[PDB]
Coordinates of C-alpha atoms and ligand atoms in Angstrom, one line a residue:
Chain A
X1 CA -9.2 2.1 131.0
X2 CA -12.0 3.8 133.1
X3 CA -12.2 7.0 135.0
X4 CA -15.2 6.5 137.2
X5 CA -17.6 5.9 134.3
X6 CA -15.7 7.4 131.3
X7 CA -13.8 5.0 128.9
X8 CA -10.4 5.5 127.4
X9 CA -8.8 3.8 124.3
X10 CA 6.4 1.3 125.5
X11 CA 6.4 2.9 128.9
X12 CA 5.4 6.2 127.3
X13 CA 2.0 4.6 126.9
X14 CA 1.5 5.0 130.6
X15 CA 2.3 8.7 130.6
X16 CA -0.3 9.2 127.8
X17 CA -2.9 7.2 129.7
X18 CA -2.1 9.5 132.7
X19 CA -2.8 12.6 130.7
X20 CA -6.0 11.0 129.4
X21 CA -7.1 10.2 132.9
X22 CA -6.5 13.7 134.0
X23 CA -8.6 15.0 131.1
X24 CA -11.5 12.6 131.8
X25 CA -11.4 13.7 135.4
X26 CA -11.7 17.4 134.4
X27 CA -14.5 16.5 131.9
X28 CA -16.5 14.6 134.5
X29 CA -16.0 17.5 137.0
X30 CA -17.1 20.0 134.4
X31 CA -20.3 18.1 133.6
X32 CA -20.9 17.7 137.4
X33 CA -20.6 21.5 137.8
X34 CA -23.1 21.8 134.9
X35 CA -20.8 24.1 132.9
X36 CA -22.3 22.8 129.6
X37 CA -25.6 24.3 130.7
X38 CA -24.3 27.9 131.0
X39 CA -25.8 30.1 128.2
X40 CA -22.2 30.8 126.9
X41 CA -21.5 27.1 126.5
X42 CA -24.8 26.4 124.8
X43 CA -24.3 29.4 122.4
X44 CA -20.8 28.2 121.5
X45 CA -22.1 24.6 120.9
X46 CA -24.8 25.8 118.6
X47 CA -22.4 28.1 116.6
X48 CA -20.1 25.1 116.2
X49 CA -23.1 23.0 115.2
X50 CA -24.4 25.5 112.6
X51 CA -20.9 25.8 111.1
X52 CA -20.4 22.1 110.9
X53 CA -23.9 21.5 109.4
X54 CA -23.1 24.0 106.7
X55 CA -19.6 22.4 106.1
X56 CA -20.9 18.8 105.8
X57 CA -23.6 19.9 103.4
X58 CA -20.9 21.7 101.4
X59 CA -18.7 18.6 101.4
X60 CA -21.7 16.5 100.2
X61 CA -22.3 18.9 97.2
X62 CA -18.6 18.9 96.4
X63 CA -18.5 15.1 96.4
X64 CA -21.4 15.1 94.0
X65 CA -19.8 17.7 91.7
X66 CA -16.5 15.6 91.7
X67 CA -18.4 12.9 89.9
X68 CA -19.3 15.0 86.9
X69 CA -17.1 14.5 83.8
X70 CA -15.7 17.7 82.4
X71 CA -15.3 17.6 78.6
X72 CA -11.8 18.1 77.0
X73 CA -13.1 21.0 74.9
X74 CA -14.2 22.9 78.0
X75 CA -10.8 22.6 79.5
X76 CA -9.0 23.5 76.3
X77 CA -11.3 26.5 75.8
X78 CA -10.8 27.6 79.4
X79 CA -7.0 27.3 78.7
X80 CA -7.2 29.4 75.5
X81 CA -9.4 32.0 77.0
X82 CA -7.4 32.4 80.3
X83 CA -3.8 31.4 79.8
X84 CA -2.5 35.0 79.4
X85 CA -4.1 35.8 82.8
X86 CA -3.7 32.6 84.7
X87 CA -0.8 30.5 83.2
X88 CA 2.0 32.9 82.3
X89 CA 4.9 33.1 84.7
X90 CA 6.9 36.3 84.7
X91 CA 9.0 37.6 87.6
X92 CA 9.8 41.3 87.6
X93 CA 12.2 43.4 89.8
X94 CA 11.2 47.0 90.2
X95 CA 11.6 50.2 92.2
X96 CA 8.7 52.6 92.8
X97 CA 8.0 56.1 94.2
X98 CA 4.6 57.0 95.6
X99 CA 3.4 60.6 95.9
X100 CA 0.3 62.7 96.8
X101 CA -0.3 64.7 93.6
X102 CA 0.1 63.9 89.9
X103 CA 2.0 67.1 89.6
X104 CA 4.7 66.0 92.1
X105 CA 5.0 62.8 90.1
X106 CA 5.4 64.7 86.9
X107 CA 8.2 66.8 88.4
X108 CA 10.0 63.7 89.7
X109 CA 9.8 62.1 86.2
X110 CA 11.2 65.4 84.9
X111 CA 14.1 65.0 87.3
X112 CA 14.9 61.6 85.9
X113 CA 14.5 62.6 82.2
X114 CA 17.5 64.9 82.4
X115 CA 19.9 62.2 83.7
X116 CA 22.6 60.5 81.7
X117 CA 21.9 56.8 81.3
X118 CA 24.6 56.0 83.9
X119 CA 22.8 58.1 86.5
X120 CA 19.1 57.2 86.0
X121 CA 18.6 54.4 88.5
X122 CA 20.7 56.3 91.1
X123 CA 18.6 59.4 90.7
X124 CA 15.5 57.3 91.0
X125 CA 16.8 55.7 94.2
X126 CA 17.6 59.1 95.7
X127 CA 14.1 60.6 94.8
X128 CA 12.4 57.5 96.2
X129 CA 14.3 58.0 99.5
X130 CA 13.5 61.7 99.6
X131 CA 9.9 61.8 98.4
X132 CA 8.1 58.5 98.7
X133 CA 5.1 58.3 101.0
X134 CA 5.1 54.5 100.9
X135 CA 6.0 54.1 104.7
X136 CA 7.7 50.8 104.1
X137 CA 10.0 52.3 101.5
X138 CA 10.4 55.5 103.3
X139 CA 11.4 53.7 106.4
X140 CA 13.8 51.2 104.7
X141 CA 15.5 53.8 102.5
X142 CA 16.1 51.1 100.0
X143 CA 15.4 53.3 97.0
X144 CA 11.8 52.3 96.6
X145 CA 12.8 48.7 96.0
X146 CA 9.8 46.3 95.7
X147 CA 11.9 43.2 95.3
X148 CA 10.7 40.4 92.9
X149 CA 7.0 40.0 92.1
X150 CA 4.4 38.5 89.7
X151 CA 1.6 40.4 87.9
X152 CA -1.0 38.8 90.1
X153 CA 0.8 40.0 93.2
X154 CA 0.4 43.8 93.0
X155 CA -2.7 45.8 92.3
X156 CA -3.7 45.3 88.6
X157 CA -3.0 48.9 87.3
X158 CA 0.4 48.9 89.0
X159 CA 1.4 45.5 87.6
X160 CA 0.3 46.4 84.1
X161 CA 2.4 49.6 84.0
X162 CA 5.4 47.8 85.5
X163 CA 5.3 44.9 83.1
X164 CA 4.7 47.1 80.1
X165 CA 8.1 48.9 80.6
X166 CA 11.3 47.5 79.3
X167 CA 14.2 47.1 81.8
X168 CA 16.2 50.2 82.5
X169 CA 13.1 52.3 81.8
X170 CA 10.6 54.1 84.1
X171 CA 7.0 55.2 83.6
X172 CA 6.8 58.6 81.8
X173 CA 3.2 59.2 83.0
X174 CA 2.2 58.8 86.6
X175 CA 0.2 55.7 87.5
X176 CA -3.2 56.1 89.3
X177 CA -3.6 54.0 92.3
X178 CA -5.9 54.6 95.3
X179 CA -2.8 55.3 97.4
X180 CA -1.8 58.1 95.1
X181 CA 0.4 58.5 92.1
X182 CA 3.3 56.1 91.3
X183 CA 6.4 56.4 89.2
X184 CA 7.9 53.1 88.4
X185 CA 11.4 52.0 87.4
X186 CA 12.0 48.6 86.0
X187 CA 15.2 46.9 86.9
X188 CA 14.6 43.6 85.3
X189 CA 11.8 41.4 83.9
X190 CA 11.9 37.8 82.7
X191 CA 10.5 36.9 79.3
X192 CA 7.0 35.6 79.9
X193 CA 6.8 31.8 79.9
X194 CA 3.4 30.2 79.7
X195 CA 2.5 26.8 81.3
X196 CA 1.5 24.3 78.6
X197 CA -2.0 23.0 78.4
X198 CA -1.0 19.5 79.7
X199 CA 0.7 21.2 82.6
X200 CA -2.3 23.4 83.4
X201 CA -4.9 20.7 82.8
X202 CA -5.3 19.4 86.4
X203 CA -5.5 23.0 87.7
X204 CA -8.1 23.7 85.0
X205 CA -10.2 20.7 85.9
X206 CA -10.1 21.9 89.5
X207 CA -11.2 25.4 88.6
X208 CA -14.0 24.2 86.5
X209 CA -15.1 21.9 89.3
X210 CA -14.9 24.8 91.8
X211 CA -17.2 26.7 89.3
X212 CA -19.7 23.8 89.1
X213 CA -19.7 23.5 92.9
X214 CA -20.4 27.1 93.5
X215 CA -23.2 27.2 90.9
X216 CA -24.7 24.1 92.4
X217 CA -24.6 25.5 95.8
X218 CA -26.3 28.7 94.7
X219 CA -28.9 26.8 92.7
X220 CA -29.7 24.6 95.7
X221 CA -29.9 27.5 98.1
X222 CA -32.4 29.3 95.8
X223 CA -34.5 26.2 95.7
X224 CA -34.4 26.1 99.6
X225 CA -35.5 29.8 99.7
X226 CA -38.6 29.3 97.5
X227 CA -39.7 26.5 99.8
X228 CA -39.1 28.4 103.1
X229 CA -41.0 30.9 105.2
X230 CA -38.7 33.9 105.4
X231 CA -39.7 36.9 107.5
Chain B
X1 CA -35.9 37.9 111.3
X2 CA -37.2 34.3 110.8
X3 CA -36.2 31.6 108.4
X4 CA -39.0 29.0 108.4
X5 CA -38.9 28.3 112.1
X6 CA -35.3 29.3 112.7
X7 CA -34.5 32.8 114.1
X8 CA -31.8 35.3 113.2
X9 CA -29.8 37.5 115.6
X10 CA -28.0 50.0 106.5
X11 CA -26.6 48.4 103.4
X12 CA -23.9 46.2 105.0
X13 CA -26.7 45.0 107.3
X14 CA -28.8 43.9 104.3
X15 CA -26.0 41.7 103.0
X16 CA -25.5 40.4 106.5
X17 CA -29.1 39.3 106.9
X18 CA -29.1 37.8 103.4
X19 CA -26.0 35.7 104.1
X20 CA -27.4 34.7 107.5
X21 CA -30.6 33.6 105.8
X22 CA -28.7 31.5 103.3
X23 CA -26.8 29.9 106.2
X24 CA -30.0 29.1 108.1
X25 CA -31.5 27.6 104.9
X26 CA -28.4 25.3 104.6
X27 CA -28.5 24.4 108.3
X28 CA -32.2 23.4 108.0
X29 CA -31.5 21.3 104.9
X30 CA -28.5 19.6 106.5
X31 CA -30.8 18.7 109.3
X32 CA -33.4 17.4 106.8
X33 CA -30.7 15.3 105.2
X34 CA -29.8 13.9 108.7
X35 CA -26.1 14.9 108.3
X36 CA -26.2 15.5 112.1
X37 CA -27.0 11.9 112.7
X38 CA -23.8 10.5 111.1
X39 CA -21.1 8.9 113.3
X40 CA -18.7 11.5 112.0
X41 CA -20.9 14.5 113.0
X42 CA -21.7 13.1 116.5
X43 CA -18.0 12.2 117.1
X44 CA -17.0 15.7 116.1
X45 CA -19.6 17.2 118.4
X46 CA -18.5 15.0 121.2
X47 CA -14.9 16.0 120.8
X48 CA -15.7 19.7 120.6
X49 CA -17.9 19.4 123.7
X50 CA -15.2 17.6 125.7
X51 CA -12.5 20.1 124.7
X52 CA -14.9 23.0 125.7
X53 CA -15.7 21.4 129.0
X54 CA -12.0 21.3 129.9
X55 CA -11.5 24.9 128.7
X56 CA -14.5 26.3 130.7
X57 CA -13.3 24.4 133.8
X58 CA -9.8 26.0 133.3
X59 CA -11.3 29.4 132.7
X60 CA -13.3 29.1 135.9
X61 CA -10.1 28.2 137.9
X62 CA -8.4 31.2 136.4
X63 CA -11.3 33.4 137.5
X64 CA -11.0 32.2 141.0
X65 CA -7.2 32.6 141.0
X66 CA -7.2 36.2 139.8
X67 CA -9.0 37.2 143.0
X68 CA -6.0 36.2 145.1
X69 CA -3.7 39.1 146.2
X70 CA -0.1 38.0 145.8
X71 CA 1.9 39.1 148.9
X72 CA 4.5 41.8 148.4
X73 CA 7.4 39.9 150.0
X74 CA 6.7 37.1 147.5
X75 CA 7.1 39.4 144.5
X76 CA 10.1 41.0 146.1
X77 CA 11.8 37.7 146.9
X78 CA 10.9 36.6 143.4
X79 CA 12.5 39.8 142.1
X80 CA 15.6 39.4 144.2
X81 CA 16.2 35.8 143.5
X82 CA 15.3 36.1 139.8
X83 CA 16.3 39.7 138.7
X84 CA 19.7 38.8 137.1
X85 CA 18.1 36.0 135.1
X86 CA 14.8 37.7 134.1
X87 CA 15.0 41.5 134.5
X88 CA 18.2 42.5 132.9
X89 CA 17.8 44.4 129.6
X90 CA 20.8 43.9 127.3
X91 CA 20.7 44.0 123.5
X92 CA 23.4 42.2 121.5
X93 CA 24.5 41.9 117.9
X94 CA 26.4 38.6 117.2
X95 CA 27.5 36.0 114.7
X96 CA 27.3 32.3 115.4
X97 CA 28.2 28.9 114.2
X98 CA 26.3 25.8 115.0
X99 CA 27.9 22.4 114.5
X100 CA 26.8 18.8 115.3
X101 CA 30.0 17.7 117.1
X102 CA 32.4 19.5 119.4
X103 CA 35.5 18.6 117.4
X104 CA 34.3 20.4 114.2
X105 CA 33.6 23.4 116.4
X106 CA 37.2 23.3 117.9
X107 CA 38.7 23.1 114.4
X108 CA 36.6 26.1 113.3
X109 CA 37.8 28.1 116.3
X110 CA 41.4 27.1 115.6
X111 CA 40.8 28.3 112.0
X112 CA 39.8 31.6 113.4
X113 CA 42.7 31.5 115.9
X114 CA 45.4 31.4 113.1
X115 CA 44.0 34.7 111.6
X116 CA 45.0 38.3 112.3
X117 CA 42.1 40.2 113.9
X118 CA 41.3 42.2 110.8
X119 CA 40.6 39.0 108.8
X120 CA 39.2 37.1 111.7
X121 CA 35.6 38.1 111.2
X122 CA 35.7 37.5 107.4
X123 CA 37.1 34.1 108.3
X124 CA 34.2 33.7 110.7
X125 CA 31.8 34.6 108.0
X126 CA 33.3 32.0 105.6
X127 CA 33.3 29.4 108.3
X128 CA 29.6 30.2 109.0
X129 CA 28.6 29.9 105.4
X130 CA 30.5 26.6 105.2
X131 CA 29.9 24.6 108.5
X132 CA 26.8 26.1 110.3
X133 CA 23.8 23.8 110.7
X134 CA 21.4 26.6 111.5
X135 CA 19.2 26.2 108.3
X136 CA 18.1 29.8 108.4
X137 CA 21.8 30.9 108.5
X138 CA 22.8 28.3 105.9
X139 CA 20.1 29.5 103.5
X140 CA 20.7 33.3 103.9
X141 CA 24.5 32.9 103.7
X142 CA 24.7 36.0 105.8
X143 CA 27.7 34.8 107.9
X144 CA 25.9 33.4 111.0
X145 CA 24.4 36.9 111.6
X146 CA 21.7 37.0 114.2
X147 CA 20.7 40.7 114.0
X148 CA 19.9 42.3 117.4
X149 CA 18.4 40.2 120.2
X150 CA 17.7 40.6 123.9
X151 CA 19.3 38.5 126.7
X152 CA 15.9 36.9 127.4
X153 CA 15.4 35.6 123.8
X154 CA 18.1 33.0 123.5
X155 CA 18.9 29.7 125.2
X156 CA 20.5 30.5 128.6
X157 CA 23.8 28.8 127.8
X158 CA 24.0 30.8 124.5
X159 CA 23.2 34.1 126.1
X160 CA 25.8 33.7 129.0
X161 CA 28.7 33.0 126.6
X162 CA 27.6 35.5 123.9
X163 CA 27.1 38.2 126.5
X164 CA 30.4 37.4 128.4
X165 CA 32.4 38.3 125.1
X166 CA 33.7 41.7 124.4
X167 CA 32.8 43.4 121.1
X168 CA 35.1 42.1 118.3
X169 CA 36.0 38.9 120.3
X170 CA 34.8 35.4 119.7
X171 CA 34.3 32.2 121.9
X172 CA 37.7 30.4 122.4
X173 CA 35.9 27.1 123.4
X174 CA 32.6 25.9 121.8
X175 CA 29.3 26.3 123.7
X176 CA 26.9 23.4 124.4
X177 CA 23.3 23.7 123.3
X178 CA 20.8 21.0 122.4
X179 CA 21.1 22.0 118.7
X180 CA 24.8 21.1 118.8
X181 CA 27.9 23.1 119.6
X182 CA 28.2 26.9 119.1
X183 CA 30.9 29.4 118.3
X184 CA 30.1 33.0 118.8
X185 CA 31.5 36.3 117.5
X186 CA 30.4 39.5 119.3
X187 CA 29.8 42.6 117.1
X188 CA 28.0 44.9 119.6
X189 CA 26.5 44.6 123.1
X190 CA 24.6 47.4 125.1
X191 CA 25.4 48.0 128.8
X192 CA 23.2 45.8 131.0
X193 CA 20.4 47.6 132.8
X194 CA 18.3 45.7 135.4
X195 CA 14.7 46.8 135.7
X196 CA 13.4 48.2 139.0
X197 CA 10.9 46.3 141.1
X198 CA 8.3 49.1 140.3
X199 CA 8.8 48.4 136.6
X200 CA 8.8 44.6 137.1
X201 CA 5.7 44.7 139.2
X202 CA 2.9 44.2 136.6
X203 CA 4.9 41.5 134.6
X204 CA 5.8 39.7 137.9
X205 CA 2.2 39.7 139.1
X206 CA 1.1 38.1 135.8
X207 CA 3.8 35.4 136.3
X208 CA 2.9 34.6 139.9
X209 CA -0.8 34.5 139.2
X210 CA 0.1 32.1 136.4
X211 CA 2.1 30.1 138.9
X212 CA -1.0 29.7 141.1
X213 CA -3.4 28.9 138.3
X214 CA -1.2 26.0 137.2
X215 CA -0.7 24.9 140.8
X216 CA -4.4 25.2 141.5
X217 CA -5.3 23.0 138.5
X218 CA -3.0 20.3 139.7
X219 CA -4.2 20.5 143.3
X220 CA -7.9 20.1 142.2
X221 CA -7.1 17.4 139.7
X222 CA -5.3 15.3 142.3
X223 CA -8.3 15.6 144.6
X224 CA -10.5 14.6 141.7
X225 CA -8.4 11.5 141.3
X226 CA -9.0 10.4 144.9
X227 CA -12.8 10.6 144.5
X228 CA -13.1 8.7 141.2
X229 CA -13.1 5.0 140.3
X230 CA -10.0 4.7 138.2
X231 CA -9.4 1.2 136.7
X232 CA -6.5 0.1 134.6
Ligands
ICB1 O1 0.8 51.6 100.4 C1 1.8 51.8 99.6 O2 2.6 52.7 99.8 C2 1.8 50.9 98.3 C3 0.8 50.5 97.6 C4 1.3 49.7 96.5 C5 0.7 49.0 95.4 C6 1.5 48.3 94.5 C7 2.9 48.4 94.7 C8 3.5 49.0 95.7 C9 2.7 49.7 96.6 N1 3.0 50.5 97.7
ICB2 O1 18.6 26.2 116.2 C1 19.6 27.0 116.0 O2 20.3 26.8 114.9 C2 19.9 28.1 116.9 C3 20.0 28.0 118.3 C4 20.4 29.3 118.7 C5 20.6 29.9 120.0 C6 20.9 31.2 120.1 C7 21.0 32.0 119.0 C8 20.8 31.5 117.7 C9 20.5 30.1 117.6 N1 20.2 29.3 116.5

């Protein structure tokens, strides 16, 4: 149906057409008022245009990369070289305590060292509630509990230390993070299980295509630079 | 600085200009490749422009509305007619049970009814883990626990019944909501405090200005309808 000039294509259908009509009426009025000729409007339209030109070009390059056949050896070599970083699933449960100075940390660790086995985690819980400067933990008073997490979910040096422990054990030397020094207690830790090559393969193809696509974009962009007047 | 013809408008800045340059290069190339001449691109631009026309029109109406001073008696009559519904602060802690059909709810309530008070809430908790159709509640298995909430956060019919209970008491007849039928147990409930007009003033003005802005859009749109050739 038609609102003045503009074209639009059960009983609910009518209500929809009513909304469409109202919208066309506002569009027409906005054009009549020349709101698309305000600088703000023009600026916004060109930002959108630039963004969309860049994204369509990207899609074009991606569609050309998706055509390239990735060799089996390249996916198997990627699997062998990156499985232990990318395809091992291992959930840990741990508590931590964060402090300002490596000395404070050392003293806390000393306070745990002297506990009987039965009282180790309780002591840790108490020291976390008393001394942590992790604001989340300090506020929750949950004994420095981090819940369950993967190695690729915490900062690398924290994750390494946590996963290197065996359950029931804590770090005997403080751990350096930018937030300060951590003492970590491991409650539990699953045995690592790696995804098999056949299970990782589609993911691997996608990661190698992503790699080709980014290299291709950077190659193309450098060719465009060498043929452009930049000042 | 300038990329071919295109124009661009200390170490973060360097990276910024570089990234901007790369983007201009891509924009120019996309133009060279005539990606802006495809049906898809023109369609997208047309949609974005239409949307933005409507938004700028609205924004304009809002800018004209914000100039209007809302009369004091309007805000005071708003306050007086709507204070007990909108401006009472009352925090509650309660447990609830949602069911599809009223009969299930009644059986559940009777199941609580046959319990001594000391085992009533444990019974409520079991019943909540078993028969609730709140998926959040069903998944947490926390006994229909809702934490703390204000009186203006729940469905009206929920809040009236939950807030009419005394602490430790539960609803003796199920409560009708669109999600089904409810049974409520009241753990805690603060004493109601109604906000003063002086405290309600800034929030109220924002509500009444909103009321006008929506009324003003409808008024104008209806006039726009009478001066247009609509054909169906
Ligand atoms: O900001 C903090 O307190 C904090 C950092 C951090 C890093 C890894 C694990 C736990 C953590 N907590
Ligand atoms: O959708 C639901 O299950 C649900 C409705 C509702 C109303 C008040 C309090 C809690 C509630 N939960």
